[PDB]
Symmetry: C2
Subunit: 163 residues, 2 copies
C-alpha cells in the first residue's frame, strides 16, 4: 500500500565524489538525512546509503559499496535514489540494478541533472517501475518523491489489467 | 563451454560522450569493431552495442539505449563490456544490470581507467561472475578477454562444488 517498509537511497558516489576518493558535499548528505529521516520517521527503513561512512569516509570501496549496494538493492523495499549528475555512477549501476532487480524505483530528479541523465534514468522510467521526481528542495522532495513513491509503488504493486 | 553464442559489448556512452550528445572516439568504436569482429567471427553474436548508430549518431536516447541495453543484457549470452573511465555510465548501469541479471560478465579493464572504476567493476568482480581484463591493445584484448571469457565463463558455468 502506501507504507514503504524500507526505502533505498543512494548518491552519485564515485561520480559526485573523486574517482575513489573523498569529497562528498555536506549539503548533499545532509539533505539525504532530512529525506532519510522522513523515511525512518514514517516507517521506511532507508537502505543502501552509508550514512556513517558517508559522513566520516564516504566513497567506500567496491568490496563494500558493491556488495552492500546490490544486497541493499534487493534488501530494500522501494528503490529511492538521487541522480546528481554527472550520471551518478554508483547510483545508476544501482539503478540499472533495480531495473533487472525488478525492485520498484523512484529517483529524485536533479532539476537539470536528471535531464543530463535521461539515458538510463529516463529509459528506466519507461521500461521499469521508475518514477521521476525533480527536487529543487528536499524540503519539497520528501513529499513530492513520497507522493510519486506511494503513487508509483501503487501503480506497480496493485493490479495492472482490469480490476 | 568455450563457444559464447553471443557476447554483449558496451562503452562509457553518455560518459565517454557528452551528456546526451555526440562525440564518440572513432579510435574507440573501431576497436570495438575489431573485437566485435572476432566475436561474430568465432560465433559470438555481439549484443548491446549500437554499431550503426554508434557510427552515425551514437549516444542514442534512453527510450532506446535503456530498452536495448537491458533487453540486450538478458538477450546476451556473455556480458562483455569496456570501462573507459569516466566510470562508463551507460556501461556500469549495464554492468550492475549484469550483476542482478546474473548474466556472466567480462570487462575490458582500461589499464588505468579500470582502476578508476574499482567501485562496481571491482565490486562486481568479487560479488558476481565478473572478469577483469585490462587491454592496452584490443589486438591483445580479443585473446586476453577471450581467454578470461571462456575461463570465467567456464568457472561460472561448470560445477562449483565437488566434481
Amino acid at each position: 500500500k502506501a507504507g514503504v517498509r524500507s526505502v533505498f537511497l543512494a548518491g552519485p558516489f564515485m561520480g559526485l565524489v573523486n574517482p575513489e576518493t573523498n569529497s562528498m558535499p555536506s549539503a548533499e548528505q545532509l539533505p539525504f538525512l532530512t529525506l532519510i529521516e522522513h523515511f525512518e520517521k514514517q516507517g521506511l527503513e532507508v537502505f543502501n546509503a552509508h550514512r556513517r561512512e558517508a559522513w566520516g569516509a564516504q566513497v567506500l570501496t567496491p568490496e563494500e559499496c558493491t556488495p552492500l549496494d546490490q544486497l541493499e538493492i534487493r534488501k530494500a523495499d522501494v528503490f529511492v535514489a538521487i541522480p546528481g549528475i554527472p550520471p551518478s555512477p554508483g547510483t545508476h549501476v544501482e539503478i540499472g540494478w533495480a531495473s533487472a532487480f525488478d525492485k520498484p524505483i523512484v529517483l529524485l530528479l536533479e532539476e537539470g541533472r536528471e535531464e543530463e541523465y535521461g539515458f538510463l534514468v529516463r529509459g528506466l522510467g519507461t521500461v521499469a517501475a521508475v518514477e521521476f521526481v525533480h527536487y529543487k528542495d528536499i524540503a519539497l522532495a520528501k513529499p513530492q518523491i513520497d507522493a510519486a513513491i506511494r503513487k508509483v509503488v501503487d501503480r506497480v504493486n496493485n493490479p495492472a489489467a482490469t480490476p
